[PDB]
Amino acid sequence: YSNEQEQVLGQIVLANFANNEGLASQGDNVWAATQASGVALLGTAGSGNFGKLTNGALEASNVDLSKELVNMIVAQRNYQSNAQTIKTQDQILNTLVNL
Amino acid sequence: GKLTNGALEASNVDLSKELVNMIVAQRNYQSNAQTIKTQDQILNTLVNL
Amino acid sequence: GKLTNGALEASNVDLSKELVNMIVAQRNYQSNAQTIKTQDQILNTLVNL
Amino acid sequence: SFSQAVSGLNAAATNLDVIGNNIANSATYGFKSGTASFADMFAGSKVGLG
Amino acid sequence: SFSQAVSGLNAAATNLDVIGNNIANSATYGFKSGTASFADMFAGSKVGLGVKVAGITQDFTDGTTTNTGRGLDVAISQNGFFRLVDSNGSVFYSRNGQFK
Amino acid sequence: VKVAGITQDFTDGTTTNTGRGLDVAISQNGFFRLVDSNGSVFYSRNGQFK
Amino acid sequence: SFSQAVSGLNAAATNLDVIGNNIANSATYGFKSGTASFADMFAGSKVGLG
Amino acid sequence: VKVAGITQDFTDGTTTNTGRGLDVAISQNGFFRLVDSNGSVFYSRNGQFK
Amino acid sequence: VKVAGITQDFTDGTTTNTGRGLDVAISQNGFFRLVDSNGSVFYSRNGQFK
Amino acid sequence: LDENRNLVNMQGMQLTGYPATGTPPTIQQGANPAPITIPNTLMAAKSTTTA
């Protein structure tokens, strides 16, 4: 303020959940607490089970491309393996039906 | 704010920070394109099965 | 709009956008070959029966 | 029948899809990576269901 | 299927393009760098559906006040915008003070 | 299925630089009304003239 | 796309050209220095065009 | 690595005489207090007034 | 192969002289003990003290 | 920020937090959070009570 003072227009409120992985994503990068996901269990940013709030910083993408670039390949090879099964299933059924 | 006479304002764009980001952007685009392979292979896989 | 004396208008088309559309068109069209083929094979079973 | 296989096939696709999203979400600022978890089935007989 | 890839692929392309614009505008005086901000999408299931671009946000942190010596060249130091008009009557806002 | 119509993305592209005199650009919505030799009338956006 | 890169590149070409002319005329008498002034370009979208 | 911050070394410089009257230097800790036209309060160490 | 673990090296580095008063450096084994906000006892070796 | 002068993200979601009351204003510790805002108002001249 211009009168060598300052108000307090609010305080940022966090939300710590005892249970996790129940937070259902809702399209945009937001989560919603559901049944058995736990109550909101509010709490300030200072103490307890909460973390510091660095100013001017942003979270990373939490993904390392080297890890999924090979999981993709192994999942693919699994996919053609399945398809060979289902190929065999189609093949088997095929011989019996034409017989 | 104040108005300084006889001067202008730069572009505030630093090249040392943008060239490094462009490498990551390119490799990320390549990795995104890599999924179309598996995906196209799966489709072919679903079709040729 | 405004004018400019000495200039030309581009084609407002992007290849990087367009090729991947062409891939899904290649894959999507094929995914329709399978329905017509399985729609005709079944009929071939009936006539032979 | 197809049950022993097609379900797994679907599972496989999901296992791929959850990867692809992570590939696409590699530039967002608030993302968290995701994987899949599976589980077998058993009927009255001791043969798996998929 | 393709939705998880192509949409995200589009995002990546867009990112590079804005980066290029920065490189293409590192010399223009009244310019502000812009960066993309993304956002995922979800259906009713637990699987994702790719990424949509959410916004092209500029960074209005002021730059360096390089001088030229001409009288009709003024520069802002903090929050503010020159108000420009056109022949038709529409209004605009800018920060390039290279007047004439 | 169908084909509702064939549309055209009318988002104007880039304005290049050629230095020639008889070249004109349209920065926003706006068209050039041209006439054929017989007297017909068409509308175009090309800035190539001589 | 190539549009923004080409525009920036042939803008920097003129930017080098004006400096070259200024250097080459650093000894003439009735000479006034030269400088280039650029201006970026946007279409109807939110992403720039160079 | 995270940039913890840019610290400043607040030792005093070398006292240099200039012969003017509107100029004062501080030998140890302390700051001049200035008021802006907008009423803001700032602090400084260069003693050279007008 | 696993990763049996990450091992830190605990050799003492050099000892830069910056000139400030509110800063120290340990010469051998020993760690500064710090407590933030709520609780917890962390250990450090950096000597830059606000 | 916003025309309604609210702490809002890239999708129209107001950030919620502890409100503040009193003079001088101070926050609460157990109140249900309300959307945070940045009013462009003016401070009132509060007379001296203690010294």
Tokens at I29, concatenated: 């084994």
CA distance C36 to E99: 68
Instruction: Read off the amino acid at residue G21.
Output: N
CB B4 within 8 A of CB E74: yes
Which burial class, exposed, middle or buried, applies to A15 when counting CB atoms under 10 A from its CB (0-12, 13-18, 19+)?
A: middle
CA distance I5 to I7: 6
Interface subset of C 7-36, CB within 8 angstroms of B: 20, 23, 27, 30-31, 33-34
SS3 C46: helix
CB J2 within 8 A of CB J13: no
CB E36 within 8 A of CB G19: no
CB E5 within 8 A of CB D24: yes
Tell me which method was used to determine the 3D structure. cryo-EM
Instruction: Read off the amino acid at residue A55.
Output: N
**Torsion angles phi and psi, residue C22, rounded to 5:** -65, -35
Greatest C-alpha distance within chain J: 48
Contacts of C12 in chain F (CB under 8 A): 9, 11-13
Tokens at A29, concatenated: 């990068």
The residue among A29, A31, A72 with the most chain E CBs within 10 A of its CB, best to mutate, is A29
Helices (DSSP H) in A1-99: which residue ranges?
65-98
Distances (CA, A) of C5 to C22, F22, F30, F32: 37, 7, 15, 14
Tokens at G13, concatenated: 């070409």
Greatest C-alpha distance within chain I: 49
CA distance E38 to A29: 9
CB E42 within 8 A of CB A25: yes
Which residues have a Cβ under 8 Å from the Cβ of I35 and sit 6 or more positions away?
I41, I42
Distances (CA, A) of I14 to C31, I17, I22, I26, J28: 68, 10, 19, 11, 50
DSSP 8-state symbol, C23: H
Instruction: Read off the amino acid at residue I22.
Output: L
Q: Do chains D and A touch (3 or more CB pairs under 8 A)?
A: yes
CB E3 within 8 A of CB E50: yes
Chains that touch B (3 or more CB pairs under 8 A): A, C, D, E
CB E63 within 8 A of CB B11: yes
Phi-psi domain of C36 (left: phi exceeds 0; alpha: psi -120 through 50; beta: other)? alpha
Which residues have a Cβ under 8 Å from the Cβ of E13 and sit 6 or more positions away?
B29, C16, C17
Which residue, I39, J32, J28, is CA-closest to A46? Answer: I39
Which residues have a Cβ under 8 Å from the Cβ of B22 and sit 6 or more positions away?
E16, E19, E20, E23
DSSP 8-state symbol, A3: T
Tokens at I47, concatenated: 């000597």
Peptide bond into J33 cis (omega under 30): no
Dihedral angle over CA of I23, I26, I31, I35, nearest 10: -10
Tokens at G27, concatenated: 């000894």
- Cα atoms found within 13 Å of the Cα of residue H49, Cβ hemisphere only: 10
Tokens at A95, concatenated: 């011989």
Which residues have a Cβ under 8 Å from the Cβ of G11 and sit 6 or more positions away?
E24, E27, G36, G38
Which residues have a Cβ under 8 Å from the Cβ of H24 and sit 6 or more positions away?
H47
DSSP 8-state symbol, I48: B
Distances (CA, A) of G13 to E17, G7, G19, G33: 21, 10, 10, 18
Q: Which long-range contacts (CB under 8 A, 24 or more apart) does F28-37 make?
A: F28/C1, F28/C2, F29/C1, F30/C1
CA–CA–CA angle F15, E58, A2 (5° rounding): 135
Which residues have a Cβ under 8 Å from the Cβ of A28 and sit 6 or more positions away?
E39, E40, E41, J11, J13
* Cβ neighbours of E58 (radius 10 Å): 11
CA distance H28 to A75: 70
What does this entry list as its resolution, in Å? 3.4
Edge-to-edge strands of the sheet including J34-35? A11-12, J16-18, J34-35
CA distance C15 to F11: 16
Q: Tell me the residue length of chain F.
A: 50
Nearest C-alpha of chain E: how many angstroms from B48?
17
CB nearest to F16's CB, from C3, C8, C12: C8
Q: Tell me the residue length of chain E.
A: 100
DSSP 8-state symbol, J45: -
Contacts of H39 in chain A (CB under 8 A): 2-3
CA distance A56 to E62: 16
CA–CA–CA angle A81, D21, A57 (5° rounding): 145
CA distance A37 to A24: 9
DSSP 8-state symbol, E24: H
**Rg of the Cα atoms in chain B:** 23
Dihedral angle over CA of J28, J32, J35, J41, nearest 10: -40
SS3 D45: coil
B39 touching A (Cβ < 8 Å)? no
- Cα atoms found within 13 Å of the Cα of residue A79, Cβ hemisphere only: 25
